């Protein structure tokens, strides 16, 4: 039989956490299920309303001399009237009738989208990118104008982006390996024939690199509020909800760009062997595998280039240049340096260190929970893949079927 | 392994000098005995070290300025430059508090193009521009009309002339050689013999063939093109030069005592020499060399032999024999070797690169390059003086001592920065002393950290001098050199090194 | 995003089998949804008021059929297609000669070989007009022009589909403060189970 | 080889909390990276440094410390007082320029010139372990009140004026302001190119044959024998290698009075005088192992093509035919063998470092005068650093305006020697097939070149290629009792394979005890 997945019993209910008025439970997935047994779709954690039993402790403190916006971020008073929306709400400046004291001294300036989206969240499972936890619209009232490099335009660098350098690189790698044999020899004799070809090409284009600031960084209101909502008590399902919303890591630096890839493989071969030992062997194969990938750039150019690459047609370099420029309009995070999301838990927040340690534990849980480690071995050395609440196996060898049961 | 990384070795420290009565400091230093090479470990940068002192004694550094003193910079400027309308100070201290400003130049003025680069001193030995040594933004009034085309320029005070003496010289040489040789030989022999007659028959046969085909083809191309373009002549005034603030300060801080390391740091920061005349220009050079050879070889041999007899009386007896033997040996060899080098100086990155492309330019991009060279020229010819000729009593106290210190240090520097110290590269690579470590610059078609990789089976090794021997005693003070550092003969050796293989001088 | 892939695989053996697929993916973009403080529609909260606090399996089925058994908490929008065309190798070798006879049409034709031409086609997402025009060419054994592919792709934005999802059960969306919210979630869990147990081939 | 097995990432326990630093109210601690996940493997959930809030139970005064010179509140930046009200905010708080109603303190109108575009990268720190930029080391924007300017030799930009009929060059770009930390910035147009191309080919071919026929009559016998061989060999080899190096400017950083970045300044003020590897390793991580003090700005293009082909064929035959009569009879008997093999490899690498995604891609594809010229134009607007000298980060401290930092500098040296030991890519496993090992954070990869695949690049698609070895790292220092301490290393990670070269470094390294 295949196996429909299995989950533990519920944990005992927590106590009622005050202020958030709720109790929580947890339930691990014992076995993911496999071979088209039913998914574990069911939620890993549960929560329930509770009438709080004891006094709540407030989340607010008086920041003191710093202003305290509607959104709860506090900003140093030089940012009063500054007109940069330093709180994301304009309570930095909506108060002010006059003397806006604006930075950038009436100079031409723009917002850069690459800087705005810098510092994507990442879920280690699948390496999928997520919205940046960084505000990237707070400027600390500095100007710090930088040039787009690919364009004569100046953009104001946001405070959290310590560097965003358009150190452009373009590469192309191509390899062809091509091989033929014919052999016609114990008392063996042969008629072995082979016709083999590997062609492999990839071209990375790097538009630029950002580095996020290591200190004094300002986070979005919703992220810090979701840390506020985060239970102090290590309720695994709530920390998993947080990690699901923001990922387990953030890119503390990233390279933005685009990529094309093409693999062509052929193996045509046959064997005959005859003779006597001290023999009636025959076999034939053909394998013929084409894969093409394009990442980044605008659709309209990207897909035309992917086609002209799949065709043997000689590429008009105008098309390649068009896609490579369009990478500036729609870059991909082709590389990044990860740091754990809990390093973004702001210090001096209430129980900040506890929430950090609990997030580190929740990440340990998240990795080990959705790890194929606790999943059934493939039958014939195929790779087991935890797809989504189920394992399936795929073989690179000639074995076949969802468990490699056959060939 | 053929290579071994040689780590950087610097000397044991000097003795301390005496404490500077004003600078209140004493200095120690080390010589670099051997640069790092081949990823050998670098030295500590601190070949210089410094200790503080008490003010044991006064010093008379307080050079009297009769002029105005530019309060923040301490530059001494003539009072006629107060309220001049121009920052002849560094800090506008000449223009503050002025009741009325007498703007001398109402006109729109440009600076001469690239004139600031010529104000920076060169390391002559490395031909490298270094920090600024002369202030080409000081005008001392000026406001004489100077024009190039319709644009008018403010000549710096330090400059005697910058003048558009415009000239161009082109050279094209192309030498194509072909030879081919062909030699076919054929040899054929046939013999037959018979007797016939109871009856008897006898036959003998022989055939021999030998065939030879040898062919060789050789093709050679040498193409060289060079353009030397000249777009202005520059001359610095010979006297009363205005030094740059940074150079001025760095000279002031020089210890009166000879302590080589500080003067070495001076040279490292600003070089050894400054430019008194230069020609500004552009250079384009293109050099293509190609050799192509083919060989074809063929030897063929065939033999037949027959011996055949029949004897009859019916009844018959007989013996008959035949051999055929055949051999073919064939070879083809084909080779091409190609080198291209393109060098470009002056112009703009677009024209620089389109000239750097492997093809000869269209005359349009040559025109565009030469037009751009006016605005961003290189220095084609230079005449220089050693930097100590700037240390002048009008600027520095004790100036004769500082000057003589520099005179010695410049010799020690020329010795120390000499690339003779590096181990030779393979592959005719050129070792360049580049800081405390040495980089083999490899001709393309040789590669790696020592130029140890090449696919060419042989490559002429050009000579390299070793370091010249130390000064011999008086009665003919003398030095010697041995061409040892890379002996030319290997791999169809290249030219021997230049002389003087020994050099001799007054004591 | 713009992630586009294509794979063409042909595979044969004898000692025999023949198999062949073509896939493409056009991955337009990614959404992730908030887990907490979800703002549910007024109809949805009314339909949680319309759920008896006791396990009336029929009415909870009416709910599960109306809104869903699951929602997509994250997923990748775009388009996809796959084509397959499997050959009789024996006849293949003599109606045609070899794959280059046909590959030359992709990257001059013979009338007899049509088993390679009568492709089975699957397409998902995309504004239908362009996919229909693709089908109208492929049905004639004509590999569609790059123009039609890019037309379809630039259609995809007008009518995408979820390439991939992670579903979570609707009972998570039950607003925690709703009156008796928890028992109603548990009833939804039973109703989900009854949905599976009832409507399944085992029956 | 098959792949090595995975290894799990492992970290030590937390070190004991550092006593709460009075001005910070922060506690710090570190772990050690006992093992990166060389292959597959669970990544560690946690970072190797951690900090927490505290209360010091003691005040600190340091806000007042420098106040002979103007010290900002936000930052330790302490300014010569003529920079106060100078007209240019010299610390990010602007406290030097607020309330400056005595505007007469302004130094000069210089803001008509922008900073040198692309000067900020020279300000960044550098990590030798990853060849990545760190946080800023130099202040990229502090001018020290100087208006020192650099002539932009490429300022000429065409304009057209339809209200006239003039095509003319605009002048906005003509000069840049030079930041204080550059001793030199020097525009200069150079290009060099080198090309080498070579072909060698050989075809060698031999045939040899004998037929021997003998006939006799007494009844009769006739016999014929044959031996024959064909043996053909072909080699084809092509190599070409192009290098093009445009230089557009050179820079040199000032060797004295270096004004550190605000962030580096604060972080260096936070480090203890007492050695604490956690702190100093965090500092080296954030600001990099190295900082830059030389420059070339430019573009590079590189192209390599290698093709190698071979063919070998041979055929052999030996035969006998016989006939005889006494009834007449005929026999024959023999053998023939034949073989053919053919090989080709074509490998091309093209790379552009330079000034636009568009034409960097175009020039990576199709080397031509069109792509060369358009990329050269793009190098006008976005040059890239093509060469840089660097020195270890601690040598910056010797030269700061902060004066002496001997103890902190020696701490940072010790910490750097440990950091360069602990995070070395040695701990990423054997990257086979000339794959490149990389260590990032607590994790390892191999970057596998196209001829190689798998978690260690272990499965080349061909049967094998000549692959050179690489060293494991140096072992621990010996527990020295004599005056000498010793460290050993071997070329086994991987060993030289399929006839590949030995790695060239040293086997033995030695230190004073």
């Amino acid at each position: 039989s295949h196996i429909d997945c299995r989950m533990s019993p519920w944990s005992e209910w927590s106590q009622c956490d005050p202020c958030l008025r709720q109790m929580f439970r947890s339930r691990s997935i014992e076995v993911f299920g496999q071979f088209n047994g039913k998914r574990c779709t069911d939620a890993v954690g549960d929560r329930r309303q509770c009438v709080p039993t004891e006094p709540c402790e407030d989340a607010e403190d008086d920041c003191g001399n710093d202003f305290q916006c509607s959104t709860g971020r506090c900003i140093k008073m030089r940012l009063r009237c500054n007109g940069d929306n330093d709180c994301g709400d304009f309570s930095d400046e909506d108060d002010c009738e006059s003397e806006p004291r604006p930075p950038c001294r009436d100079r031409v300036v723009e917002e850069s989208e690459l800087a705005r989206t810098a510092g994507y969240g990442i879920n280690i499972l699948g390496m999928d990118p997520l919205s940046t936890p960084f505000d990237n619209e707070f400027y600390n009232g500095l100007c710090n104008r930088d040039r787009d490099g690919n364009t004569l335009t100046y953009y104001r660098r946001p405070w959290n982006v310590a560097s965003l350098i358009y150190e452009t690189k373009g590469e192309k790698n191509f390899r062809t390996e091509h091989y033929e044999e014919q052999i016609e020899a114990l008392f063996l004799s042969y008629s072995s024939k082979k016709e083999k070809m590997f062609l492999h090409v990839k071209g990375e284009i790097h538009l630029g690199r950002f580095v996020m600031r290591n200190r004094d960084v300002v986070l979005t209101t919703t992220f810090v509020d979701d840390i506020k909502a985060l239970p102090t008590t290590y309720e695994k399902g709530e920390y998993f909800a947080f990690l699901e919303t923001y990922g387990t890591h953030y890119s503390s630096s990233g390279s933005l760009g685009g990529l094309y890839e093409l693999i062509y493989v052929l193996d045509k071969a046959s064997m005959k062997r005859k003779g006597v030992e001290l023999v009636n062997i025959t076999s034939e194969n053909l394998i013929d595998d084409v894969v093409s990938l394009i990442r980044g750039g605008t659709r309209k150019y990207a897909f035309e280039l992917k086609e002209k690459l799949l065709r043997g047609t000689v590429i008009d370099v105008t098309d390649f240049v068009n896609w490579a420029s369009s990478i500036n309009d729609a870059p991909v995070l082709i590389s990044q340096k990860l740091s754990p999301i809990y390093n973004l838990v702001p210090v001096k927040m209430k129980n900040a260190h506890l929430k950090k340690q609990n997030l580190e534990r929740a990440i340990e849980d998240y990795i080990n929970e959705f790890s194929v480690r606790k999943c059934h071995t493939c039958q014939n050395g195929g790779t087991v893949i935890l797809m989504d609440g189920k394992c399936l196996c795929a073989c690179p060898f000639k074995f076949e079927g969802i468990a490699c049961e056959i060939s | 392994v053929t290579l071994m990384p040689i780590d950087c070795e610097l000397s044991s420290w000097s003795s301390w000098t005496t404490c500077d009565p004003c600078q209140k400091k004493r200095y120690r230093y080390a010589y670099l005995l051997q640069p790092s090479q081949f990823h050998g470990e670098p030295c500590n940068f601190s070949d210089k070290e410094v200790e503080d002192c008490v003010t044991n004694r006064p010093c008379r550094s307080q050079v009297r300025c009769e002029g105005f003193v530019c309060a923040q910079t301490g530059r001494c400027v003539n009072r006629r430059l107060l309220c001049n309308g121009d920052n002849d100070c560094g800090d506008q201290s000449d223009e503050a508090n002025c009741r009325r400003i007498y703007k001398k130049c109402q006109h729109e003025m440009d600076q001469y193009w690239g004139i600031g680069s010529l104000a920076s001193g060169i390391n002559l030995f490395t031909n490298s521009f270094e920090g600024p040594v002369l202030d080409h933004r000081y005008y001392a009034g000026g406001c004489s009309p100077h024009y190039i085309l319709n644009t008018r320029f403010r000549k710096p005070y330090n400059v005697e002339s910058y003048t558009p003496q415009t000239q161009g010289k082109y050279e094209f040489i192309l030498k194509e050689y072909e030879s081919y040789s062909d030699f076919e030989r054929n040899v054929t022999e046939k013999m037959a013999s018979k007797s016939g007659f109871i009856s008897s028959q006898s036959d003998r046969g022989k055939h021999y063939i030998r065939r030879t085909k040898r062919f060789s083809h050789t093709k050679s191309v040498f193409l060289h093109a060079r353009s030397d373009l000249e777009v202005a002549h520059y001359k610095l005034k010979p006297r009363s030069l205005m030094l740059h603030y940074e150079f001025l300060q760095r000279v002031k801080r020089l210890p009166l005592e000879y302590s080589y390391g500080e003067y070495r740091d001076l040279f490292r920061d600003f070089g050894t020499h400054y430019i008194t005349e230069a020609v500004l220009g552009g250079i384009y050079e293109y050099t293509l060399v190609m050799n192509k050879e083919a060989m074809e070889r063929g030897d063929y041999t065939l033999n037949n032999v027959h011996a055949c007899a029949k004897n009859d009386f019916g009844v018959s007896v007989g013996k008959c024999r035949g051999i055929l033997n055949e051999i073919k040996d064939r070879n083809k060899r084909d080779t091409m070797v190609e080198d291209l080098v393109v060098l470009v100086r002056g112009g703009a990155s677009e024209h620089i690169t389109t000239l750097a492309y492997q093809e000869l330019p269209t005359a349009d991009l040559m025109q565009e390059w030469g037009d751009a060279v006016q605005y961003n020229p290189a220095i084609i010819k230079v005449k220089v003086e050693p930097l100590y000729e700037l240390v002048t009593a009008t600027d520095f106290a004790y100036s004769s001592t500082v000057r003589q210190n520099m005179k010695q240090a410049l010799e020690e520097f020329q010795k120390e920065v000499s690339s003779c110290h590096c181990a030779p590269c393979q592959g005719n690579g050129v070792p360049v002393l580049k800081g405390s470590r040495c980089d083999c610059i490899c001709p393309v078609g040789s590669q790696g950290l020592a130029c140890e990789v090449s696919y060419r089976k042989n490559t002429p090794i050009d000579g390299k001098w070793n370091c010249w021997s130390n000064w011999s005693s008086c009665s003919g003070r003398r030095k010697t050199r041995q061409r040892q550092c890379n002996n030319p003969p290997p791999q169809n050796g290249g030219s021997p090194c230049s002389g003087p293989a020994s050099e001799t001088l007054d004591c | 995003e713009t992630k586009g892939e294509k794979n063409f695989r042909t595979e044969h053996y004898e000692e025999e089998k023949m198999f062949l697929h073509v896939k493409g993916e056009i991955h337009l973009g990614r959404f992730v949804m908030r887990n907490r403080d979800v703002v549910l529609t007024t109809t949805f909260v009314d339909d949680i008021k319309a759920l008896p606090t006791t396990y009336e399996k029929g009415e909870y089925f009416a709910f599960l059929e109306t809104y869903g058994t699951h929602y997509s908490s994250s997923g990748s929008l775009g388009g996809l297609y796959e084509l397959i065309y499997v050959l009789d190798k024996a006849s293949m070798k003599r109606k045609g000669v070899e794959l280059k006879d046909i590959k030359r049409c992709l990257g001059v034709n013979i009338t007899s070989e049509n088993l390679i031409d009568d492709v089975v086609s699957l397409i998902r997402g995309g504004t239908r007009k362009y996919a229909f025009e693709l089908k109208e060419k492929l049905l004639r054994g004509t590999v569609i022009d790059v123009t039609d592919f890019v037309n379809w792709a630039s259609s995809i934005n007008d009518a995408p589909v979820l390439i991939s999802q992670k579903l979570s059960p609707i009972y998570n969306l039950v607003p925690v403060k709703m009156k008796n919210a928890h028992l109603k979630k548990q009833n939804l869990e039973r109703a989900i189970e009854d949905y599976i147990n009832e409507f399944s081939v085992r029956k | 080889a098959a792949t090595p097995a995975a290894v799990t990432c492992q970290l030590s326990n937390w070190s004991e909390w550092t006593d709460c630093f009075p001005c910070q109210d922060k506690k710090y601690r570190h772990r050690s990276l006992l093992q990166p996940n060389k292959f597959g493997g669970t990544i560690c959930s946690g970072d190797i440094w951690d900090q927490a809030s505290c209360s010091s139970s003691t005040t600190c005064v340091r806000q007042a410390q420098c106040g002979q010179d103007f010290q900002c509140k936000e930052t330790g930046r302490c300014l010569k007082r003529h920079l106060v009200c100078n007209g240019d905010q010299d610390c990010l708080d602007g406290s030097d320029e607020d309330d400056c109603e005595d505007v007469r303190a302004i130094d000069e109108d210089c803001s008509q010139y922008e900073p040198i575009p692309g000067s900020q990268k020279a300000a960044l720190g550098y990590n030798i372990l990853t060849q990545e930029d760190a946080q800023s080391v130099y202040d990229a924007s502090y001018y020290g009140g100087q208006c020192e300017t650099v002539y932009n030799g490429e300022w000429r930009e065409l304009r057209y004026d339809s209200t006239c009929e003039r095509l003319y060059y605009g002048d906005d770009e003509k000069y840049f302001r030079k930041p204080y930390n550059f001793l030199k910035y020097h525009f200069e147009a150079l290009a060099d190119t080198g090309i080498s191309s070579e072909f060698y080919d050989n075809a060698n071919d031999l045939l040899s044959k004998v037929k021997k026929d003998k006939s006799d009559s007494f009844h009769s016998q006739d016999t014929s024998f044959l031996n024959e061989l064909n043996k053909y060999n072909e080699k084809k080899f092509i190599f070409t290698r192009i290098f093009t190096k445009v230089q557009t400017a050179h820079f040199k950083m000032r060797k004295d009075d270096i004004m550190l970045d605000e962030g580096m300044l604060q972080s260096l003020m936070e480090l203890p005088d007492q050695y604490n590897y956690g702190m100093y390793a965090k500092f080296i991580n954030d600001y990099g192992t190295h900082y830059i003090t030389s420059g070339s700005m430019g573009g590079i293009y590189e192209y390599i093509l290698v093709i190698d082909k071979a063919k070998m064929e041979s055929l052999g035959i030996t035969s006998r035919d016989i006939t005889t009569c006494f009834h007449c009879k005929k026999f024959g008997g023999g053998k023939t063998e034949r073989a053919r093999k053919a090989m080709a490899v074509e490998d091309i690498i093209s790379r552009v470092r330079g000034g636009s995604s568009g034409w960097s891609g175009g020039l990576a594809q199709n080397r031509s005068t069109i792509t060369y010229r358009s990329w050269g134009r793009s190098l006008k607007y976005n040059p890239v650093v093509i060469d840089f000298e660097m020195q270890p980060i601690h040598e910056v401290l010797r030269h700061t305006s902060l004066g002496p930092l001997e103890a902190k500098r020696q701490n940072l040296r010790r910490a750097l020697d440990q950091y360069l030991m602990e995070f070395n890519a040695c701990r990423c496993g054997p990257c086979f097939n000339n794959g490149v090992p990389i260590l990032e954070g607590t994790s390892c990869r191999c970057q596998c070149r196209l001829g190689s695949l798998g978690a260690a690049c272990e499965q080349t698609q061909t049967e094998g290629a000549k692959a050179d070895g690489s060293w494991s790292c140096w072992s621990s220092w010996s527990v020295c009792r004599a005056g000498i301490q010793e460290r050993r290393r071997e070329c086994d990670n991987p060993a030289p394979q399929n006839g590949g070269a030995s790695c060239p470094g040293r086997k033995v390294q030695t230190q004073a005890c």
Side-chain angles (χ1 to χ4, degrees), chain B residues 5 46 92 320 322 324 365, chain D residues 108 211 213 215 373 376 398 506:
Chain B
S46 322
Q92 319 197 327
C320 179
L324 177 153
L365 301 179
Chain D
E108 180 142 62
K211 304 190 181 184
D213 304 342
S215 321
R373 189 180 170 148
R398 278 189 165 119
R506 187 169 295 73

Side-chain angles (χ1 to χ4, degrees), chain A residues 13 21-22 25 38 41-43 45-49 128-130 222 226 237-238 240-242 244-246 264 282-300 302-304 307-308 310-312 332 366 388 398 407, chain C residues 1-15 17 25-26 28 30 32-37 70 81 89 93 99 103 106-107 145-146 149-150 153-154 157 165-169 171-172 174-178 182 185-186 196:
Chain A
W13 292 89
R21 305 178 282 158
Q22 300 157 93
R25 295 191 294 173
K38 257 63 180 70
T41 68
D42 79 324
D46 155 30
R47 85 205 204 258
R48 189 227 296 208
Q49 186 182 30
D128 301 320
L130 294 104
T222 50
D226 291 4
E238 218 70 13
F240 282 18
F242 183 67
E244 286 159 7
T245 280
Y246 296 112
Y264 212 107
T282 299
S283 70
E284 191 258 311
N285 63 261
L286 178 64
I287 303 92
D288 168 47
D289 161 81
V290 154
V291 64
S292 175
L293 161 55
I294 196 73
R295 297 193 63 123
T298 56
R299 289 189 299 266
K300 66 167 299 178
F303 312 137
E304 328 186 19
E307 303 256 6
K308 297 316 307 186
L310 192 133
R311 261 64 140 170
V332 158
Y366 191 84
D388 171 332
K398 297 179 182 175
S407 184
Chain C
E1 186 93 349
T2 285
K3 181 169 205 176
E5 312 134 14
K6 267 137 210 199
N7 177 224
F8 297 54
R9 190 132 62 100
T10 84
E11 188 168 32
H12 306 207
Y13 299 57
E14 304 184 38
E15 184 182 326
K17 75 175 76 180
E25 180 191 4
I26 306 296
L28 160 56
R30 169 131 173 171
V32 176
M33 293 298 214
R34 288 200 68 91
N35 296 168
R36 312 315 210 183
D37 157 49
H70 307 70
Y81 58 51
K89 191 176 189 289
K93 194 49 48 179
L99 77 89
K103 186 179 177 291
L106 179 67
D145 297 298
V146 310
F149 291 61
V150 73
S154 64
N157 192 279
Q165 294 135 348
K166 181 172 290 180
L167 301 315
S168 312
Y171 63 69
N172 258 142
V174 63
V176 70
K177 314 193 101 81
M178 163 61 36
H182 193 273
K185 139 158 48 173
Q186 301 309 133
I196 325 160

Side-chain angles (χ1 to χ4, degrees), chain C residues 122-142 145-165:
Chain C
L122 179 173
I123 303 85
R124 292 343 328 156
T127 311
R128 75 182 301 275
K129 314 93 181 176
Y130 312 97
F132 179 89
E133 187 156 22
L134 289 169
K135 286 171 61 176
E136 283 277 289
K137 287 183 177 176
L138 271 299
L139 179 60
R140 287 178 278 180
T142 297
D145 297 298
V146 310
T147 53
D148 198 306
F149 291 61
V150 73
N151 298 339
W152 173 74
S154 64
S155 100
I156 299 303
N157 192 279
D158 311 349
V161 49
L162 288 106
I163 328 298
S164 75
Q165 294 135 348

Side-chain angles (χ1 to χ4, degrees), chain B residues 329-402:
Chain B
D329 178 23
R330 176 163 308 301
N331 167 325
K332 299 98 172 187
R333 171 172 36 70
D334 181 354
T335 84
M336 171 174 71
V337 86
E338 174 183 332
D339 310 328
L340 168 68
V341 177
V342 183
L343 167 148
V344 197
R345 273 96 187 98
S349 66
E350 179 180 334
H351 312 126
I352 284 302
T353 55
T354 199
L355 285 170
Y357 181 58
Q358 74 201 19
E359 298 298 353
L360 284 169
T362 168
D364 270 12
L365 301 179
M366 288 296 288
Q367 171 158 351
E368 298 280 29
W369 174 64
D371 178 52
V373 170
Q374 299 171 123
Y375 297 94
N376 192 33
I379 286 148
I380 278 72
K381 188 188 185 177
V382 84
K383 302 187 183 290
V384 292
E385 269 187 296
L387 203 64
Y388 60 72
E389 308 296 34
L390 304 183
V391 305
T392 57
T394 192
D395 303 305
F396 321 104
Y398 309 94
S399 61
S400 59
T401 297
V402 154

Side-chain angles (χ1 to χ4, degrees), chain B residues 286-299:
Chain B
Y286 183 114
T287 296
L288 168 65
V289 178
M290 164 164 172
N291 302 281
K292 175 176 183 179
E293 181 295 329
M295 192 284 270
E296 188 148 336
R297 172 185 273 164
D299 292 307

Side-chain angles (χ1 to χ4, degrees), chain A residues 8 30 36 64-65 97 128 153 169 232 246 257 263 315 382 388:
Chain A
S8 73
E30 328 181 317
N36 220 67
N65 305 329
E97 310 92 335
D128 301 320
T153 288
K169 311 177 199 316
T232 189
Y246 296 112
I263 329 292
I315 195 61
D388 171 332

